[PDB]
Design a protein around this motif. Sequence first.
Motif, PDB file in Angstrom:
ATOM      1  N   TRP A  79       0.822  -1.214   0.000  1.00 43.40           N
ATOM      2  CA  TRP A  79       0.000   0.000   0.000  1.00 43.40           C
ATOM      3  C   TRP A  79       0.858   1.266   0.000  1.00 43.40           C
ATOM      4  CZ3 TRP A  79      -4.612   0.239   4.097  1.00 43.40           C
ATOM      5  CH2 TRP A  79      -5.539   1.241   3.695  1.00 43.40           C
ATOM      6  N   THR A  80       1.934   1.271   0.805  1.00 47.33           N
ATOM      7  CA  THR A  80       2.840   2.405   0.984  1.00 47.33           C
ATOM      8  C   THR A  80       3.798   2.615  -0.184  1.00 47.33           C
ATOM      9  OG1 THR A  80       4.239   0.895   2.258  1.00 47.33           O
ATOM     10  CG2 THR A  80       2.791   2.370   3.535  1.00 47.33           C
ATOM     11  N   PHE A  86      -3.634   8.481  -0.353  1.00 47.70           N
ATOM     12  CA  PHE A  86      -4.457   7.388   0.166  1.00 47.70           C
ATOM     13  C   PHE A  86      -5.956   7.661   0.041  1.00 47.70           C
ATOM     14  CE2 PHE A  86      -0.570   6.899   3.060  1.00 47.70           C
ATOM     15  CZ  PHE A  86      -0.047   5.801   2.384  1.00 47.70           C
ATOM     16  N   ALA A  89      -6.523   7.140  -3.595  1.00 43.68           N
ATOM     17  CA  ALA A  89      -5.743   6.054  -4.178  1.00 43.68           C
ATOM     18  C   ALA A  89      -5.118   6.467  -5.516  1.00 43.68           C
ATOM     19  CB  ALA A  89      -6.604   4.801  -4.331  1.00 43.68           C
ATOM     20  N   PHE A 145      -7.442   0.974  -2.828  1.00 47.08           N
ATOM     21  CA  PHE A 145      -6.115   0.486  -3.177  1.00 47.08           C
ATOM     22  C   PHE A 145      -6.197  -0.874  -3.872  1.00 47.08           C
ATOM     23  CE2 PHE A 145      -1.942  -1.142  -2.909  1.00 47.08           C
ATOM     24  CZ  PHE A 145      -1.912  -2.286  -2.100  1.00 47.08           C
TER      25      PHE A 145
END
Lengths: 461, 461
Positions: A79-80, A86, A89, A145
Amino acid sequence: MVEFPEGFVWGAATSGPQTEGNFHKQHQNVFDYWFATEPEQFDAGVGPDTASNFYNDYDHDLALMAQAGVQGLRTSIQWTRLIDDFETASLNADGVAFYNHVIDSMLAHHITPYINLHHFDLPVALYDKYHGWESKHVVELFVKFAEQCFKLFGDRVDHWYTFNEPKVVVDGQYLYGWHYPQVINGPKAVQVAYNMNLASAKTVARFHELSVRPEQQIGIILNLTPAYAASDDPADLAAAEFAELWSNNLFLDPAVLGHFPEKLVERLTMDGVLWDATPTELAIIAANPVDSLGVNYYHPFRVQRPDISPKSLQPWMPDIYFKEYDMPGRMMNVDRGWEIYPQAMTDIARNIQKNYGNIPWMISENGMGVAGEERFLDKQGVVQDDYRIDFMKEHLTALAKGIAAGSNCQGYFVWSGIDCWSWNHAYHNRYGLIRNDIHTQTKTLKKSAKWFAELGERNGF
Amino acid sequence: MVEFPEGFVWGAATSGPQTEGNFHKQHQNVFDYWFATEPEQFDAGVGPDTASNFYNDYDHDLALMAQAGVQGLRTSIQWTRLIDDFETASLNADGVAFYNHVIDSMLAHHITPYINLHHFDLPVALYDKYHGWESKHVVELFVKFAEQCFKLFGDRVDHWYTFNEPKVVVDGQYLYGWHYPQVINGPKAVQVAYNMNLASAKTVARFHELSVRPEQQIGIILNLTPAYAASDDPADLAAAEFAELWSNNLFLDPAVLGHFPEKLVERLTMDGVLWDATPTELAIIAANPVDSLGVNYYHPFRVQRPDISPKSLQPWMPDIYFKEYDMPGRMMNVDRGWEIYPQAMTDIARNIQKNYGNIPWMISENGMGVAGEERFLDKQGVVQDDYRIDFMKEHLTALAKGIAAGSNCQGYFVWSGIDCWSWNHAYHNRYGLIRNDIHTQTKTLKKSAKWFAELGERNGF
């Protein structure tokens, strides 16, 4: 002498956070931040910033895994690394480029990609801003995501997983201090288990709305390790009852059957710690069970009565109902602290077949971690890890009895392909078929690698 | 434990005149003129000119309604703001822009628009020039106004209403002095009730010729409170039978059945006060019933014989056949002077189900007004309006058992979302889920607003 079904998959498992290193990664996950501020909480202050150098050396590492008989590789997308913003996305172009490189490279080395979306690596910023997995809004950001991963890589990835072991995130972040933020709070933990089951079901739903080919399928990876009672004492039996509901059914039942375990909900309610759920959320969980199950299995779970009555004045914890038990004469992986009990493989297989519709499943992790493997090198720097070969034989034997009994197991993935970074234990214990000399990031097949390649050729031993 | 059909709409109801303010409005409606000339007729001298500041604050107001659980919002477009010249229904550009902003803002906040075309706001110029609703030319000018609304906003509004309670316009303008021009004339009231039924039907015909989507549908909002007879004596039973026909069938029957109630026209005929109708007009009424029904309920309606003979020498009024009656032991809203009797909703449900082909309908208004709500502010400025929650709980329980018996009710709209201007009563009584401090136009969710949001989540309570 021990053979396996036609088409059985022989693979290896890792994760992004434990292999890539942090090279040019946009955001810190909770472990990255933990290491940046308290490096002393990690073995020798070795954190994840380099790990096993997979960001830089993926092509040759995949070639070595193929040499080692890895027909399927299961790892994870961070994800990072993938996401710029965030909330929406939006995409980090360099991170998308990197995951297309490794997936394309897996295919070019004839490795089937199995892609997991999450492996203990929550972005620290989402913990700071929303308290992470406690937030049903963070749940939504996770689904967005996931949606991007499916749209970006779904054209050449058939096999997906929502999560590796959500229970370890619950235990680690909210119960026992294993994971930053090291919160110690039972009721929060109950809400986090709920929220992660909900995130998985919402991701399954979006996956099937977006899928194009029939062979695309999405599953989840759990510990299903059985809870053996220490004795037939009623108090030990009751401890094992609750330990079973809480450590296995908490995730297995909603993922596969569509609903939470009835007796657990009743106990959580009576104790006043039940999660906050809505009918709309529960309906999503009921309508989108996983297509398949990944079983991580390492050691049994044995349990006796708690030392004090669960009605004692204490903060609520699932542990007020059970205490872990040490069986005299147990087989032990000592420099590691785990019992070795292969027969649990057979029990898990039978349980899936009888009680969970014999859903298609795989052993997604099975492995033995050993310290100081330099002592077992031979004249060419090849680790003589016969212990690892015998460990694999004992568990595969148990697996094959479950399969012959009729359990729908379809693959076996060793933890792990190449020695990788084991969180706060770093490289103290090695698990790979392939040794990594972490000073130079030079890797070499162990003896087990050649055994594994041969196992896949004969589909047995 | 009390649950509602899947798809049920939880909404709130207001109107243009009672929320917008007269900011930059081109024309005066009858209330505008009435406040401009006799402000002493309005509570605390508070008039329509600012109301609840919706003209300036609509976007944040809608955001507040979305957090109060408003799933659909019902409000109205003002004839006096949209139209430049009434004879051609030419457009006022700023009025058009205002309502596109409102409608767009609703969709952006995920609130379904429910648009009503008329709520007591006749243009005062049209009363002065034609005597307003007495004129069948004015009826035609309303249809030209409606056509414009459909063309401008039909692309993103599916749910429409022609009128909110024409009966209150008949009563207010022509019977009891509640609405400027305060004419007191029974025979004219009879003609105005015919004309507005005709105007609604012509508007329904115009709607369906212009519709593009099958989802588009238009109804009318009525009060259908039954006329409960005081006793079983025939004089009381007679009074209630006429009160029923007069206050309900006069509009329900032409709207849903396409014809007028025969025993009613017979009595209007014998009393020499029947409306003037043509067969072609009656054909339009019969060919364009509404697609749905909006029901407003607040309190029951109890009725006894008149004190003198209807044959007495006196101006013709509907009331010569009935007198309102006060039942001993009635449950009272003693501050507002209203009896509480939730069982009437169950009776309404059954009547629609058994006698009006179970047409699709909603509770388009239900709510409780309370004066001086600052008495219940917490330490954080939140009205503790538990009385309002209990009111809703009692009526929703009655509503649900009508749904259980088979009535095709599909929604429930609270009067009101935000405290709004209640005509000559202004802000003396508050109906909202959301408080408005009218001096500052600062709005705050009440306790009931949080209780309305969760109700939408459980779809029950």
